[PDB]
Design a protein around this ligand. Sequence first.
Ligand SMILES: O=S(=O)(O)c1cccc2cccc(Nc3ccccc3)c12
Ligand SMILES: O=S(=O)(O)c1cccc2cccc(Nc3ccccc3)c12
Ligand SMILES: [Ca+2]
Ligand SMILES: [Ca+2]
Ligand SMILES: [Zn+2]
Ligand SMILES: [Zn+2]
Lengths: 96, 96
Amino acid sequence: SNTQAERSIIGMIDMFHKYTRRDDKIDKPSLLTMMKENFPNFLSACDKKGTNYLADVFEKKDKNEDKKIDFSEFLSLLGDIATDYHKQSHGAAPCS
Amino acid sequence: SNTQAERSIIGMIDMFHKYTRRDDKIDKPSLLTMMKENFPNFLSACDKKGTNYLADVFEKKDKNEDKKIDFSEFLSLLGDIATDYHKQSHGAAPCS
Ligand SMILES: O=S(=O)(O)c1cccc2cccc(Nc3ccccc3)c12
Ligand SMILES: O=S(=O)(O)c1cccc2cccc(Nc3ccccc3)c12
Ligand SMILES: [Ca+2]
Ligand SMILES: [Ca+2]
Ligand SMILES: [Zn+2]
Ligand SMILES: [Zn+2]
């Protein structure tokens, strides 16, 4: 009964919960695992352009520097990845 | 070859582009149409709780008051809907 858009949002929440600890936040090795498992094609397009996105993603997105990614920070990471795909739809190179 | 997470992000960009005008932004009647077509179950759960989410969504999310929703504002709207589903996963009532 859910639409594709509702299923995508529920799916992204359920993906976040594969990787959280008991405080409902994701630690650094779990974030990097999450990226490799769920965004491998995005990560390959970055590598091809000489960008290792996992080198700095945790430090970039851990805004409050508590060394965990909470849901708000995870949504900011998904916004960055979406922004990259949106710019590619307008003719930008991947990972720009 | 895309994963479910990459397909969800590409799908949400493609959904945004069903509803944009030529300036790559969505006007108010098109935003409301987008919500009804793509988030009907979310909108039903809101109605059941006495909240008509379409009454104010455009004015809430049009941050720069140019009377269009651009991609950044659309991503903030998807973050709000995701935040609601995330709170429901933690035992909150829908549309809280
Ligand atoms: O939930 S699914 O319906 O497969 C799904 C549906 C839609 C979007 C999804 C996005 C990321 C991960 C999923 N799978 C997933 C699989 C195991 C645990 C957590 C997420 C997605
Ligand atoms: O693209 S689909 O592969 O169907 C798709 C796949 C994954 C997530 C989607 C989310 C919203 C709309 C879609 N469909 C859609 C259909 C027509 C135009 C724009 C979006 C989604
Ligand atoms: Ca943090
Ligand atoms: Ca605007
Ligand atoms: Zn949670
Ligand atoms: Zn666009």
